[PDB]
Each structure stands twice: as C-alpha cells, then as structure tokens.
DNA sequence: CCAGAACAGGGTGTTCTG
DNA sequence: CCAGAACACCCTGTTCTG
C-alpha cells in the first residue's frame, strides 16, 4: 500500500493505473510519448530496484507494461 | 587493431594503459575516484558494446579492470 | 599522443500548476 | 488525487588545455 510496483521505492500515488513513485511515472510517460527502442544487456529480467532502475530502461519499461501501466487509466477508471 | 577493448566502439588511443575510446576512458577514471560500488542488476555478465555500454556500470567497470586499465600507465 | 579540465548532451528525478 | 509541464539533477560523452 506504500511502495512502487516497478522499482519498490516509496510510491507517490496511483499513476497510469498503478502504484508507482514519481520517477517511474515520468519514465513511463517519456517512454510512451517518444521512442523506447531500448536493448537489454542481460536476459530481459534485470532487477529493477531503487538504484538499479537506471541500468536497464528496456527491463524497466517492460516491468511498467507488465504491471498494467497505461496513460488513459484515470479516464478509463471514470467509466 | 583500433576498436575499444571495453565496448568495441572505435578506440581513441591508449588510455590508462589500454586501447580504449574516450567515453570508457573517463568512465573508468570517474569510477575509481567515485568509489560508487556499482552493483549489477543481472548476473555479473552483462554485454558491454557501444549501443549498451551505459546499461551496466558494474560490468563496464569490471570489464575495464579485466582489460588491464589502471590509473598509472608508467 | 595522452591525462584531466571544461564544456556538452542525454537521461533521470522533483516540484509546480491544472 | 493525479494528469502534464516546468524546473532540476545526475550520468555519460566530446572538445579543450596542460
Ligand atoms: Zn518506481
Ligand atoms: Zn535488462
Ligand atoms: Zn569504450
Ligand atoms: Zn551487469
């Protein structure tokens, strides 16, 4: 009830439909509004926690998608 | 030969005793002075090529070390 | 030609405003 | 509360100077 589902830092609200911190929120929005042609250097399961979230934007974006994050979630909730 | 021995980008000279590119050179200096204790997010065997050298400072640093980089190139 | 400094770009993170 | 914007910092990479 308190921590980000993407990196396990302290959540700051339900953003794009999921509990996340502010840094995961803006990271997702940026990935979604632009390009997200990232490449993993490991095996697409990089551990995304508070520090290492910087290491692999590929895995970080994957873990946002897998958690259900989507921009329209707030509008959709109102329906 | 003229590719960087850490990330395989085009090398720019012999830096800290190893053929490397500029970004790796300064990455390595920054790593040593910073004492950041990088931690890998995978299995300590990340691929470090040009397109991915930013992804893992722990592995990039380790790879600098294994390549023989050292701040006193006599 | 190379180390370190200075300057620059890219990527990430926090506070503000609707 | 939570959206996007504006402001801010961190991390990486290139050109300058000793
Ligand atoms: Zn997060
Ligand atoms: Zn990854
Ligand atoms: Zn390199
Ligand atoms: Zn690694």
What is the number of E strands of chain A?
Answer: 2
Structural class of chain A, by secondary structure, is: mainly alpha
- CATH architecture tag of chain A: 2-Layer Sandwich
Number of helices of chain A: 3
Name the CATH superfamily classification of chain A: Erythroid Transcription Factor GATA-1, subunit A
Bound molecules: zinc ion
Radius of gyration of chain A, rounded?
12 Å
Largest interchain contact: A-B, 15 and 15 residues
Approximate helicity band of chain A: 25-40%
Q: Sketch the topology of chain A as an H/E string, one letter per element.
A: EEHHH
Protein name (chain A): Glucocorticoid receptor
Organism (chain A): Rattus norvegicus (Rat)
Modified residues (N6-acetyllysine) (chain A): 63, 75, 77-78
Family (chain A): Belongs to the nuclear hormone receptor family. NR3 subfamily.
Report what the structure shows.
The structure is a homodimer. The first copy, chain A, is mainly alpha-helical and 79 residues long. Chain A has one domain (1-79): 2-Layer Sandwich (Erythroid Transcription Factor GATA-1, Chain A), CATH 3.30.50.10. In chain A, 34% of the residues lie in helices and 8% in strands. Chain A contains 3 helices and 2 strands; from the N terminus they run E-E-H-H-H. Chain A has helices at 22-33, 57-66, 73-77; strands at residues 13-15, 18-20. Chain A has a two-stranded antiparallel ribbon. In chain A, strand 1 (13-15) and strand 2 (18-20) form a beta hairpin. The longest helix of chain A is centred in the middle third of the chain and has 12 residues, at 22-33. Chain A is globular and about 40 Å long. Chain A starts with 12 loop residues before the first strand and ends with a helix. Chain A: Belongs to the nuclear hormone receptor family. NR3 subfamily. Chain A: The modification N6-acetyllysine is found at residues 63, 75, 77-78. Chain A: A zinc finger (NR C4-type) spans 4-24, 40-64. Chain A: This is Glucocorticoid receptor. Chain A: It comes from Rattus norvegicus.
């Amino acid at each position: 009830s308190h921590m980000c589902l993407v990196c396990s830092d302290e959540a700051s609200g339900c953003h794009y439909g999921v509990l996340t911190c502010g840094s995961c929120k803006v990271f997702f929005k940026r990935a979604v509004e632009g390009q997200h042609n990232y490449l993993c250097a490991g095996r697409n399961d990089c551990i995304i926690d508070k520090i290492r979230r910087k290491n692999c934007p590929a895995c970080r974006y994957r873990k946002c998608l897998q958690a259900g994050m989507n921009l329209e979630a707030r509008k959709t909730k109102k329906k």
